[PDB]
Amino acid sequence: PHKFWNTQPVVQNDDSSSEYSFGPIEIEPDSFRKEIYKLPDGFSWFDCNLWDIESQDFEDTYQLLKDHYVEDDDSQFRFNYSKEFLRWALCVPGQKKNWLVGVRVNETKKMVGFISAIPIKVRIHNCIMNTSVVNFLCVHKKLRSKRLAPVLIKEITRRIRCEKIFQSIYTCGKNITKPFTIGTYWHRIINVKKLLEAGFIGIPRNMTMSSLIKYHRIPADKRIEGFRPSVDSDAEQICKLFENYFMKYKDVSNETMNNLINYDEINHSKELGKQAYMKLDKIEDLQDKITIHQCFNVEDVKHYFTNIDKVIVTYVRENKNKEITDLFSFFIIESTVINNERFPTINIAYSYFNIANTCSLKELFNEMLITAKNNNCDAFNTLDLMQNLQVIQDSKFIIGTGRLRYYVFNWKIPQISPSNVGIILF
């Protein structure tokens, strides 16, 4: 039984609707709480200065997440996001200073809480909007189970609404309310010895370390040339590549895609905002198409689909006309081995956005797997989003533990396959 989420404009697990529809759950442009939320006495909010990678805030935030952010089911691994990664993930085009929210102990100046939002643009069926992604919610372990998380969530909500934004996207490794999709984790083992020594996998009784190495090898043959890291000047071509990709997989007509309802222009009125409601006749109308995805302008492409060592890798394929025709990308996050002092961390690649036009998605992922190996990644992680299942099938990926639940705040999305979802959170 929820005490917080049952009061929020999200679809509840017991939602009893017999129709598939889209649109805002509520249109409440001026009725939200505007006063800052109270923290326990002795604590204070601050805008986290992640704008200087050398800042004390950045050091405190890095340390908070390193020691208290997400752990796996059995508390063997914990994420160790680098400062360079956090800068790339949070200082995005259009970011607001007050969407990076810390909690500090007044007497000691020690940071004990963080929550972030980043701005993104999303298409949801026939609508388009500026929205937010909430991520990196973290409370110091000594302060857990004291209901601080709803305080942080309400305060980031207030800060997002003060920017005239009333929706958000977020994921969680557990069920909270009703998710609009569920992602499955898939792991491609790259460095077998390192992952055995870390305890991520073990040596099966019918195998050996040498046969395990042999089985998990990234296939070497069948290389496709023409791939190269992207550079800044690619941004326009990459932006066009994504447009054609989303146009290819659209779940609405061509005319609708060129005439999306801009929710930004109507979310100020309970009457005009009603235009965003859309009844879907059949859920099969969405099969094999993309229903919700991020939208990238050229500035966004330049920031996200770049190449920063140990953070983000983006390659493009050119054709004989030197036109970009394909793209693969993955980001890199280190994880700490909690129960290990001598082998403390491991580098993990995570599939980002991938577009295959001149080769198969399998061929592209094989090139990306080799590039991940050459970037010293110990494993390659992917979700069954977009068309990734085509690659995950008939492959050597191994299923992960748990599931990734996708949520949208204050919007209705029918439950859809993760193949219909083009939203990757960091």
Ligand X SMILES: CCCCCCCCCCCCCC(=O)SCCNC(=O)CCNC(=O)[C@H](O)C(C)(C)COP(=O)(O)OP(=O)(O)OC[C@H]1O[C@@H](n2cnc3c(N)ncnc32)[C@H](O)[C@@H]1OP(=O)(O)O
Residues 112-141 that bind ligand X (CB under 6 A): 132, 134-139
Distance CA 124, CA 286 (A): 12
Q: Which does 166 bind (CB under 5 to 8 A by kind): ligand A1BHQ, Cl ion, ligand X, none?
A: ligand X
Report H helices in 249-345: 254-257, 298-304
Q: Is 180 annotated as a binding residue?
A: no
The answer to the question of residue 296 lying near ligand X (CB under 6 A) is no
The answer to the question of residue 3 lying near ligand X (CB under 6 A) is yes
Distance CA 317, CA 363 (A): 12
Q: Is 143 annotated as a binding residue?
A: no
Question: Binding segment for ligand A1BHQ among 43-51, 180-188, 253-261, 388-396 (CB under 6 A)?
Answer: 180-188
Position among 33, 97, 147, 223 found at the interface with ligand X (CB under 6 A): 147
The answer to the question of residue 406 lying near ligand A1BHQ (CB under 6 A) is no
CA neighbor of 178 nearest in space, from 425, 422, 407: 407
Q: Which is nearer to ligand A1BHQ, 177 or 351 (CB)?
A: 351
Position among 45, 350, 352, 411 found at the interface with ligand A1BHQ (CB under 6 A): 350
Distance CA 133, CA 180 (A): 15
CA neighbor of 99 nearest in space, from 18, 155, 140, 148: 155
Distance CA 43, CA 141 (A): 16
- The distance of closest approach from Cβ of residue 312 to ligand X in the complex, given in angstroms and rounded to an integer, is 20
Output the CA angle 407-398-425, nearest 5 degrees: 25
Distance CA 377, CA 347 (A): 5
- The distance of closest approach from Cβ of residue 338 to ligand A1BHQ in the complex, given in angstroms and rounded to an integer, is 10
- Burial class of residue 18, CB neighbours in 10 A (0-12, 13-18, 19+): exposed
The answer to the question of residue 186 lying near ligand A1BHQ (CB under 6 A) is yes
Position among 91, 105, 149, 213 found at the interface with ligand X (CB under 6 A): 149
Q: Is 137 annotated as a binding residue?
A: yes
Q: Which is nearer to ligand A1BHQ, 195 or 423 (CB)?
A: 195
Residue-wise DSSP of 199-267? TSS---TT--HHHHHHHHPPP-SS----EEE--GGGHHHHHHHHHHHHHHTBSS-HHHHTT-EEGGGTT
Output the CA angle 421-123-101, nearest 5 degrees: 85
- Whether the CB-CB separation of 316 and 295 falls below 8 Å is answered with no
The answer to the question of residue 4 lying near ligand X (CB under 6 A) is yes
CA dihedral of residues 190, 194, 199, 202 (deg, nearest 10): 60
Q: Which does 175 bind (CB under 5 to 8 A by kind): ligand X, Cl ion, ligand A1BHQ, none?
A: Cl ion
Q: Is 5 annotated as a binding residue?
A: yes
Which tokens is 69 given?
């952010």
Position among 82, 98, 126, 168 found at the interface with ligand X (CB under 6 A): 168
Provide the mask over 55-84, with x wherever binding to ligand X is found by CB under 6 A and - wherever it is not: -------------xxx--------------
Place of tokens 């923290």: 39
Site of interaction with ligand A1BHQ (CB under 6 A): 70, 72, 77, 171, 173, 185-187, 195, 198, 200, 335, 346, 348, 350, 379, 381-383, 400, 404, 425
Site of interaction with ligand X (CB under 6 A): 2-5, 68-70, 132, 134-139, 144-150, 153, 156-157, 160-161, 165-168, 170, 172, 176, 409-410
Binding residues for tetradecanoyl-CoA, by number, are 2-5, 136-137, 139, 145, 147-149, 174
